[PDB]
Design a protein around this ligand. Structure first.
Ligand SMILES: *[C@@H]1O[C@H](CO)[C@@H](O[C@@H]2O[C@H](CO)[C@@H](O[C@@H]3O[C@H](CO)[C@@H](O)[C@H](O)[C@H]3NC(C)=O)[C@H](O)[C@H]2NC(C)=O)[C@H](O[C@@H]2O[C@@H](C)[C@@H](O)[C@@H](O)[C@@H]2O)[C@H]1NC(C)=O
Ligand SMILES: *[C@@H]1O[C@H](CO)[C@@H](O[C@@H]2O[C@H](CO)[C@@H](O)[C@H](O)[C@H]2NC(C)=O)[C@H](O[C@@H]2O[C@@H](C)[C@@H](O)[C@@H](O)[C@@H]2O)[C@H]1NC(C)=O
Lengths: 188, 187
């Protein structure tokens, strides 16, 4: 599920944190039980399972390599700079991902449109229903640690801000020959 | 710690909670804790926190039903997290880091060090005159609840100051205070 050989300064423990965090968020949106600011997100039809992409992880790694964020702009990308602390790497990674979702919970999703909002831009990239690939990276840059995820597909702003379509769990039709896996997420 | 109660927590996460708080507080006291721009502090009357099993009880009780219901006896910080398949210490660490990162998103006004609801958890953690904290967490299926209870905190509107600007180791808020080896006040 990973197999990323490169000089990426990361091993699979944090990659699994990244990957399963995304797919847990997406499963609970699809099931209609992820908590909004008030109430719940979802259910969503067309919410696809994410797979790791080593190419996208390289894009994530390259954007923070110099210790100043510089995205390649080939793919949607979420980024945050956190204070480096004397705790394990899973803690920074976890803190970033939790923070990305708390932005959403602090501001609140309109669950009629499920539109992107700049105040939870990272959550929108993480929840974008029709994406199927993610790659993330982090780098300690002295007093700060940069954490960033890159996605194959994302919202297209401003015209197409919808993060996911309201619909029944396991309705998987956005790609031909899609099935719903045991995670309650679509795959193709 | 010595918290005997049915608190569903052991001392390893208690230490992460406590040490994290006192690191932040001493970095503010020394004037080296990063703000959004620049640094926070130095602060006078920044007291070291001690654990309180009573406050931990108040924390544990507010979340044991998996819906947040504070007792409202003491200032309290709370977050509902997405559950992660990581050791509990790392979920606690991630939460505490996240609480500080809110502050650096909005930024503290270092002329006033005023409370800001947008970083309420950092504010509760940084409140200089508090000396006791109790924290708890509970895995609730897909989500995890994490919360800290403080004996003292800001009082709005009358006392919005998280800490007062001033020299490290000035410890006069309470009589018979001293500055310990952590450069934090205690009595
Ligand atoms: C990704 O890298 C991290 C950081 O190196 C790995 O986590 C570390 O894994 C090592 C073991 O390979 C842990 O060390 C050992 O800890 C135990 C308990 O104290 C002791 O028996 C042993 O003496 C100790 N070794 C030494 C010399 O210290 C280490 O504690 C652990 N965490 C950190 C922050 O260093 C990680 O390994 C994965 O996670 C650990 C927790 C184990 O489950 C391990 O089997 C896993 O592979 C690396 N991930 C991968 C996939 O390799
Ligand atoms: C609190 O609960 C933790 C989870 O059960 C304990 O960690 C576990 O300790 C085992 C040895 O007793 C060790 O083999 C396990 O890998 C470890 N599990 C995890 C997820 O870390 C913890 O014990 C403390 O921490 C571990 C890492 C060791 O250093 C122990 O010697 C420690 O006591 C429990 N804490 C206490 C104070 O009992």
């Amino acid at each position: 599920e990973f197999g990323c050989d490169g000089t990426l300064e990361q091993n699979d423990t944090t990659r699994e944190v990244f990957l399963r965090f995304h797919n847990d968020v997406r499963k609970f949106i699809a099931l209609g039980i992820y908590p909004n600011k008030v109430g719940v997100l979802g259910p969503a039809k067309n919410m696809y399972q994410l797979k790791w992409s080593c190419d996208l992880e390289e894009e994530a790694h390259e954007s923070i390599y110099s210790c100043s964020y510089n995205p390649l702009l080939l793919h949607p990308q979420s980024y945050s700079k956190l204070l480096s602390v004397d705790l394990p790497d899973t803690d920074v990674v976890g803190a970033t991902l939790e923070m990305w979702t708390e932005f959403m919970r602090i501001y609140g999703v309109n669950t009629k449109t499920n539109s992107y909002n700049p105040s939870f831009s990272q959550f929108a990239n993480m929840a974008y229903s029709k994406n199927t690939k993610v790659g993330c990276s982090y780098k300690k840059c002295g007093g700060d640690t940069l954490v960033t995820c890159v996605y194959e597909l994302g919202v297209k702003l401003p015209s197409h801000p919808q993060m996911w379509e309201n619909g029944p769990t396991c309705v998987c039709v956005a790609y031909t020959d899609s099935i719903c896996n045991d995670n309650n997420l679509c795959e193709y």
